[PDB]
Amino acid sequence: SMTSHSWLCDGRLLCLHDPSNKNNWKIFRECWKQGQPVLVSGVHKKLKSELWKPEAFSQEFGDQDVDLVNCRNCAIISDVKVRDFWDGFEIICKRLRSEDGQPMVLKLKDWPPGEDFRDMMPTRFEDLMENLPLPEYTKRDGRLNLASRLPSYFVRPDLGPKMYNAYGLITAEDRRVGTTNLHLDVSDAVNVMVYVGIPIGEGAHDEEVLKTIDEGDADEVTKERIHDHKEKPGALWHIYAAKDAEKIRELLRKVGEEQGQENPPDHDPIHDQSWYLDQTLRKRLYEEYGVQGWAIVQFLGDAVFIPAGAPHQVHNLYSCIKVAEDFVSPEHVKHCFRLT
Ligand SMILES: Cc1nc2ccc(O)cc2o1
Ligand SMILES: [Cl-]
Ligand SMILES: [Cl-]
Numbered sequence: 001s002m003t004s005h006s007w008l009c010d011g012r013l014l015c016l017h018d019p020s021n022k023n024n025w026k027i028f029r030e031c032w033k034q035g036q037p038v039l040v041s042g043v044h045k046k047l048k049s050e051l052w053k054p055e056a057f058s059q060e061f062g063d064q065d066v067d068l069v070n071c072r073n074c075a076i077i078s079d080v081k082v083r084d085f086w087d088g089f090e091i092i093c094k095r096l097r098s099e100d101g102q103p104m105v106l107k108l109k110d111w112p113p114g115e116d117f118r119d120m121m122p123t124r125f126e127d128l129m130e131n132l133p134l135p136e137y138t139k140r141d142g143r144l145n146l147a148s149r150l151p152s153y154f155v156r157p158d159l160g161p162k163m164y165n166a167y168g169l170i171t172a173e174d175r176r177v178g179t180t181n182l183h184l185d186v187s188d189a190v191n192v193m194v195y196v197g198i199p200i201g202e203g204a205h206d207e208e209v210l211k212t213i214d215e216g217d218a219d220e221v222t223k224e225r226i227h228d229h230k231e232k233p234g235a236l237w238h239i240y241a242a243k244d245a246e247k248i249r250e251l252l253r254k255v256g257e258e259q260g261q262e263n264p265p266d267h268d269p270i271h272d273q274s275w276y277l278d279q280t281l282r283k284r285l286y287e288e289y290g291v292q293g294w295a296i297v298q299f300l301g302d303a304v305f306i307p308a309g310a311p312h313q314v315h316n317l318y319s320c321i322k323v324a325e326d327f328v329s330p331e332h333v334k335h336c337f338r339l340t
């Protein structure tokens, strides 16, 4: 039976089922006020699927110059064509190779660049913005988005949305690497999975994906969503409450010192965006500091709501196209105030 919602993370994560239900706000606002993330499924069914394919991006924009990142070692690949990224998105035999002769796991950096999504892709912009869930919070002019309404005493978000494009991590060694390292944002955000690419060539690689979700601490109901098939898994997230950010900084200063980094006692390891919390570090955070997070698998068409101030990291299971919009809810406006 169709239902309004369900729970993941053993009751700690709200999952809304109908992205355009006019009564979603009544269930959402209780969880949101408590500083929790929220998941909304089904957004892909609202979108024009032909606008979100890797082959269309390559055909329309392939001659633009861009930089890539090697996710395994953080090396920058400078001033290449955007088709060099898109043509290897699902076909492994077409990827740029490292010195060892392996195909690289790449992230497309800052594309479209800065605030240029709307000018570059006006049809994509309309398709996304008209289909975002919780539209009183998430639209540029929504009644519960204070972004356009605040004076300079508040850090205001850039004009969005922003696109996040990267290959899937593949090997047992790759399990300890992030697509996006641990960081926080002073605005709220909604992140939508608009396409998941499952390759062919080294097709048959779903085996190491199961071990990553399991070791990632995914709850038993998320494992039913994985093991049932039916839906394509994109990325594994770990999100932490804003109230636990300083305890995470204390752990990462202790570990930086143990690993012989030489850092002033005050430096900010979350702002540096240099760490990925692997299974060893997540267990140490729980046991030594008393901090629990939320382990979230974002499937095709899932919208993740990330509260302002909440530290979070992303690990792509397969090749992903994500689109995110920042907003300023009244519940979390304290996180962007410039005094006290
Ligand atoms: C519809 C569908 N195709 C899949 C391929 C791999 C997988 O891990 C889940 C999938 O769900
Ligand atoms: Cl808060
Ligand atoms: Cl467009």
Ligand SMILES: [Cl-]
Residues within 6 Å of the ligand: 025, 133, 134, 135, 136, 137
């Ligand atoms: Cl709403």
Ligand SMILES: [Cl-]
Residues within 6 Å of the ligand: 179, 180, 181, 273
């Ligand atoms: Cl990163």
Ligand SMILES: [Mn+2]
Residues within 6 Å of the ligand: 183, 184, 185, 312
């Ligand atoms: Mn973020």
